[PDB]
Motif scaffolding. Sequence first.
Motif, PDB file in Angstrom:
ATOM      1  N   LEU A   1      -0.246   1.209  21.960  1.00 49.48           N
ATOM      2  CA  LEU A   1      -0.963   1.206  20.677  1.00 49.48           C
ATOM      3  C   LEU A   1      -0.916  -0.102  19.883  1.00 49.48           C
ATOM      4  O   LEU A   1      -1.297  -0.177  18.699  1.00 49.48           O
ATOM      5  CB  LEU A   1      -0.485   2.388  19.775  1.00 49.48           C
ATOM      6  CG  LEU A   1      -0.621   3.760  20.453  1.00 49.48           C
ATOM      7  CD1 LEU A   1      -0.012   4.861  19.580  1.00 49.48           C
ATOM      8  CD2 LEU A   1      -2.091   4.062  20.730  1.00 49.48           C
ATOM      9  N   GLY A   2      -0.436  -1.146  20.513  1.00 47.20           N
ATOM     10  CA  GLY A   2      -0.337  -2.404  19.814  1.00 47.20           C
ATOM     11  C   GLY A   2       1.096  -2.674  19.386  1.00 47.20           C
ATOM     12  O   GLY A   2       1.363  -3.725  18.817  1.00 47.20           O
ATOM     13  N   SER A   3       2.007  -1.729  19.639  1.00 43.03           N
ATOM     14  CA  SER A   3       3.418  -1.981  19.282  1.00 43.03           C
ATOM     15  C   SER A   3       4.098  -2.732  20.429  1.00 43.03           C
ATOM     16  O   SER A   3       3.614  -2.771  21.579  1.00 43.03           O
ATOM     17  CB  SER A   3       4.198  -0.700  19.003  1.00 43.03           C
ATOM     18  OG  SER A   3       4.443  -0.034  20.243  1.00 43.03           O
ATOM     19  N   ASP A   4       5.210  -3.372  20.137  1.00 40.63           N
ATOM     20  CA  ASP A   4       5.907  -4.086  21.206  1.00 40.63           C
ATOM     21  C   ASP A   4       7.301  -3.511  21.372  1.00 40.63           C
ATOM     22  O   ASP A   4       7.827  -2.887  20.450  1.00 40.63           O
ATOM     23  CB  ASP A   4       6.174  -5.535  20.794  1.00 40.63           C
ATOM     24  CG  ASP A   4       4.935  -6.365  20.777  1.00 40.63           C
ATOM     25  OD1 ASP A   4       3.965  -6.082  21.411  1.00 40.63           O
ATOM     26  OD2 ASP A   4       5.045  -7.428  20.042  1.00 40.63           O
ATOM     27  N   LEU A   5       7.916  -3.731  22.541  1.00 40.15           N
ATOM     28  CA  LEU A   5       9.285  -3.291  22.780  1.00 40.15           C
ATOM     29  C   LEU A   5      10.101  -4.583  22.941  1.00 40.15           C
ATOM     30  O   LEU A   5       9.746  -5.440  23.743  1.00 40.15           O
ATOM     31  CB  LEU A   5       9.325  -2.500  24.094  1.00 40.15           C
ATOM     32  CG  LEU A   5      10.730  -2.008  24.402  1.00 40.15           C
ATOM     33  CD1 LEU A   5      11.073  -0.961  23.339  1.00 40.15           C
ATOM     34  CD2 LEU A   5      10.679  -1.377  25.806  1.00 40.15           C
TER      35      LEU A   5
ATOM     36  N   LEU B   1       4.041 -13.156  15.463  1.00 44.47           N
ATOM     37  CA  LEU B   1       4.505 -12.173  14.475  1.00 44.47           C
ATOM     38  C   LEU B   1       4.385 -10.735  14.936  1.00 44.47           C
ATOM     39  O   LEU B   1       4.463  -9.836  14.099  1.00 44.47           O
ATOM     40  CB  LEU B   1       3.804 -12.348  13.103  1.00 44.47           C
ATOM     41  CG  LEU B   1       3.959 -13.730  12.479  1.00 44.47           C
ATOM     42  CD1 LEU B   1       3.128 -13.798  11.213  1.00 44.47           C
ATOM     43  CD2 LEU B   1       5.420 -13.871  12.105  1.00 44.47           C
ATOM     44  N   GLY B   2       4.240 -10.542  16.252  1.00 44.86           N
ATOM     45  CA  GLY B   2       4.128  -9.202  16.774  1.00 44.86           C
ATOM     46  C   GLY B   2       2.688  -8.817  16.926  1.00 44.86           C
ATOM     47  O   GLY B   2       2.407  -7.750  17.423  1.00 44.86           O
ATOM     48  N   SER B   3       1.735  -9.650  16.486  1.00 46.03           N
ATOM     49  CA  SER B   3       0.336  -9.252  16.653  1.00 46.03           C
ATOM     50  C   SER B   3      -0.133  -9.599  18.057  1.00 46.03           C
ATOM     51  O   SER B   3       0.449 -10.433  18.758  1.00 46.03           O
ATOM     52  CB  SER B   3      -0.591  -9.958  15.696  1.00 46.03           C
ATOM     53  OG  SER B   3      -0.635 -11.326  16.048  1.00 46.03           O
ATOM     54  N   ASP B   4      -1.196  -8.910  18.464  1.00 50.78           N
ATOM     55  CA  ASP B   4      -1.749  -9.164  19.772  1.00 50.78           C
ATOM     56  C   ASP B   4      -3.118  -9.819  19.674  1.00 50.78           C
ATOM     57  O   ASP B   4      -3.859  -9.634  18.724  1.00 50.78           O
ATOM     58  CB  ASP B   4      -2.040  -7.809  20.458  1.00 50.78           C
ATOM     59  CG  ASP B   4      -0.779  -7.142  20.889  1.00 50.78           C
ATOM     60  OD1 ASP B   4       0.271  -7.701  20.916  1.00 50.78           O
ATOM     61  OD2 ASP B   4      -0.937  -5.936  21.323  1.00 50.78           O
ATOM     62  N   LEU B   5      -3.480 -10.537  20.724  1.00 49.62           N
ATOM     63  CA  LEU B   5      -4.785 -11.160  20.858  1.00 49.62           C
ATOM     64  C   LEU B   5      -5.393 -10.497  22.085  1.00 49.62           C
ATOM     65  O   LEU B   5      -4.789 -10.507  23.169  1.00 49.62           O
ATOM     66  CB  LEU B   5      -4.613 -12.659  21.133  1.00 49.62           C
ATOM     67  CG  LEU B   5      -5.959 -13.285  21.336  1.00 49.62           C
ATOM     68  CD1 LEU B   5      -6.748 -13.209  20.039  1.00 49.62           C
ATOM     69  CD2 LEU B   5      -5.701 -14.720  21.777  1.00 49.62           C
TER      70      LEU B   5
END
Lengths: 339, 346
Positions: free
Chosen positions: B9-13, A9-13
């Motif tokens: 910052l935790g955003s994705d492209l 969902l776009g979150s990171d681990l």
Amino acid sequence: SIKIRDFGLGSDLISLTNKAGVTISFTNLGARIVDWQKDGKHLILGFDSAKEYLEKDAYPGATVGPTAGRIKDGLVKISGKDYILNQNEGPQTLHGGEESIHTKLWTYEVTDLGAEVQVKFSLVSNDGTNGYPGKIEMSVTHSFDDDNKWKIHYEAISDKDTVFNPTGNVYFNLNGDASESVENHGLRLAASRFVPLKDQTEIVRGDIVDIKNTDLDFRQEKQLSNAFNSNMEQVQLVKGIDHPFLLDQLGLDKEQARLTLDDTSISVFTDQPSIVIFTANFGDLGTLYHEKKQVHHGGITFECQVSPGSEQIPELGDISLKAGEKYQATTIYSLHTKL
Amino acid sequence: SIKIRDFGLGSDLISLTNKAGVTISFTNLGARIVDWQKDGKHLILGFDSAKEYLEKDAYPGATVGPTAGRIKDGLVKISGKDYILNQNEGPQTLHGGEESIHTKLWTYEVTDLGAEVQVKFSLVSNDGTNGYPGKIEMSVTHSFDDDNKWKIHYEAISDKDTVFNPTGNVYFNLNGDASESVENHGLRLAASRFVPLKDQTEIVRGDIVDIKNTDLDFRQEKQLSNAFNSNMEQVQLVKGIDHPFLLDQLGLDKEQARLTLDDTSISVFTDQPSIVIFTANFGDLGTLYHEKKQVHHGGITFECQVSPGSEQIPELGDISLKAGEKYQATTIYSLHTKLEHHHHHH
Ligand SMILES: OC[C@H]1O[C@@H](O)[C@H](O)[C@@H](O)[C@H]1O
Ligand SMILES: OC[C@H]1O[C@@H](O)[C@H](O)[C@@H](O)[C@H]1O
Ligand code: NA
């Protein structure tokens, strides 16, 4: 070592491995702890992807707030005025209301200091969000070091007088499997009093009670089964433990609690005055963790914070946050292994 | 092809390349468009990392709301009740207030349909956020297809009667360089009227004015320099354009605007009734885009939405959203080559 990967969902681990080979991992979804393992065993409860938290239970391991716990009728008085917060558990506001900060993707930055690595998560709670005055700029830094210390440091600043008392919601289970009760773990806890609950709604009853020499006295290490098999009405009420314990001596240098299972122990340190203990009193729910169906009592929390219920029992403390004041809180979970 | 990587910052492209080799990219920080290139040339303005947006200008390419534009004194009337929203530009509420949706990380899921790829971003605006009744469950789907169409589809549902009228803040600059003014582009726009602003505060004046045959008449294609060089009161007020244009004919089927430079054109379609055009009237600010200092007039937006000021000019529309009612809006930007002959010099 540090490793960052997509958690869904776009979150990171974000996973951190220290010199000892111990691994701890977090996600920006809810500035939350996802796993903590040693020699391949999990010490805490957690899921394998972001979707699971959203579908199964969004609370485990998360940062909950702005106010942790239940607020009777969703009511707080700020500067003499009554404010009604979002009500999401009947008329109570539990853990900040619906769709709170534990369900948002926070931004973050990683800082590698060598023996220690920090992950600083940030989020802005807009003024008025779920009824709370703001805006509140919040940050939660989770850090892990080579001494096996996992520390959580919170900071916040509000543009207006408001309320603020977040907590971290990790559930421990040294069995490393949710299908196994924590009744076999030993618990020590430096608290002689507790806050009883009124009834099944879990709001506070109104009083503070001394637990010395009762089934809930853990001043001296004891196995959880004891409490679990107790006939105290408070235990019977919730079918386990779901209460705020008042710490006897305040300060970050004191080990406030200790959870032990065999050769493995977790020590808790905090600058907060209370620890809310909840033993996953989920009955037959059977939530699945790692393919394992969770059992009643298949986990236990140590939520360090100002005790819930200060709205009715001021002796408990005051969670007000004045405009421009900087809020700070620190909680540490230390892992030890006997040799 | 779909590719994803951390953007900061935790955003994705999220980068998509269609079968014609055109690439476009988005970030979940503000459900925003980051870049759109053809043959190695940027067709829009954007930065190279998330932090730049947060430190230089957080609006470019973003989804903005819940209400786009300025609301005088932050006051709205919702179901007979007056509500005051966050005021972040003097007493005005601009683009939903401070630290609004354009600044949040939205969750997202990508759906590959082969000739089309969709990126659906989601976020919940809690009840009371910035003064808006909610909660509001929002979703923005950005999609790109083999026909070079970039489509934006908005959806939303509120638990409570509220207001909703978001828009997309892309800035085009077919020069592919922010340091080059768009006065050399040609513009065609199907609108005969516009909404003048009261003064420097930029709230609406209160009237609707006919612009046929003035320097703001682009019904028939003309270079943007004609507007920029105008001494019309409204242009001098804002040092360019920063106004809502009322479309003469509604419907998603009609080409409402067309922006051309040489052999490249961008056409605009929408189901909304107006287009707010802002030509980056930043003077000498010089924000750096890809290390190029942006010039005054170094960009142009086509914010399709219900025009701002309906609070004062009811005729503009009603942006109220009833509890339980499904909001939807669709805006499309399509890219073409050699659509027409445009060979000018500036
Ligand atoms: O995390 C969910 C749990 O959180 C505890 O703080 C609360 O007292 C429990 O009743 C349960 O709601
Ligand atoms: O910077 C974003 C821009 O957005 C436009 O809608 C607005 O009218 C401009 O004045 C400026 O605020
Ligand atoms: Na991500």
